[PDB]
């Protein structure tokens, strides 16, 4: 996370960190006792056995509850960067209560309105290309960028209706490497997306790109 601040205990009850081979890698969102939603690219092509999840902690190294994976479902139509969601079934059921809860989801076929506010969180780098890896969770609030604008920055075919973007014209606030899969939410804390891709991090005129929960609601309900 670039341009953000330390997150507070309870701001994202459902956020999880996801390590691979004992190192940081991606974030996610707990949907229920045995389901995590992350980015397709966090898990596709990789050995499911390398992944541990942590829920109920601001820290990516300690606290909360952990689980390995039972199975992984990548979007049937995950292609390039499009349809970039995967469902992870957990080996250990993580009950709600205390510091953990489950994510409510953006409405089926909804699309984040340009200019509206959204907040993303994660343990990724704090600068583009930075050697930083925060222990404690970070968060930034950014405006949604209209798809028409994002298409201007990246190209019409690069940005699909299963993606939406967020960022500030002059840069300064973004998700970054290590935040992949992690939640971006509206001001009801509804899960509207997962961190996916971008040109660098927090660059002027280059939005963060997100897999769209609204646009992909069908996939999620089916495999959750």
């Amino acid at each position: 996370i670039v341009g953000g601040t330390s997150a507070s205990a309870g701001d994202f009850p459902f956020i999880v960190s996801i390590s691979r081979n004992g190192g940081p890698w991606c974030g996610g969102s707990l949907l229920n006792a045995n389901t995590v939603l992350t980015a397709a690219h966090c898990v596709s092509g990789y050995a499911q056995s390398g992944f541990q999840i942590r829920a109920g902690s601001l820290s990516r190294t300690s606290g909360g509850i952990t689980s390995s994976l039972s199975s992984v479902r990548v979007h049937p139509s995950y292609s390039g960067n499009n349809n970039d969601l995967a469902i992870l079934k957990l080996s250990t059921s993580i009950p709600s209560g205390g510091n953990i809860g489950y994510a409510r989801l953006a409405a089926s076929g909804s699309d984040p309105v340009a200019g509206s506010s959204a907040t993303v969180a994660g343990w990724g780098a704090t600068s583009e290309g930075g050697s930083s890896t925060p222990v404690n969770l970070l968060k930034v609030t950014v405006p949604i960028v209209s798809r028409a604008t994002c298409r201007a920055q990246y190209g019409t075919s690069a940005i699909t209706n299963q993606m939406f973007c967020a960022g500030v014209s002059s840069g300064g606030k973004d998700s970054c490497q290590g935040d992949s899969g992690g939640p971006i939410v509206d001001s009801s804390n509804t899960l509207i997306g997962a961190v996916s891709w971008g040109n660098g991090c927090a660059r002027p005129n280059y939005s963060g790109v997100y897999a769209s929960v609204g646009a992909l609601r069908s996939f999620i309900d089916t495999y959750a």
């Binding site: 691979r20 081979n21 004992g22 190192g23 940081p24 890698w25 991606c26 980015a39 690219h41 966090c42 390039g80 960067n81 343990w123 990724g124 780098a125 890896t133 201007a152 920055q153 990246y154 190209g155 019409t156 075919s157 690069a158 998700s175 970054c176 490497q177 290590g178 935040d179 992949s180 961190v195 996916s196 891709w197 971008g198 040109n199 660098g200 991090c201 280059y206 790109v209």
Partner: protein
């Protein structure tokens, strides 16, 4: 500046050259370095 449609990797992240001639890259934290 890249030729649209080209691909590369920066560590563990796949990058794609978009129509506007820049690299779009995924946002994983790459461990074993």
């Amino acid at each position: 500046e890249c030729t649209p449609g080209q691909t590369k990797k920066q560590d563990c992240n796949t990058c794609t050259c978009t129509p506007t001639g820049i690299w779009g890259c995924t946002r994983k934290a790459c461990r074993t370095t």
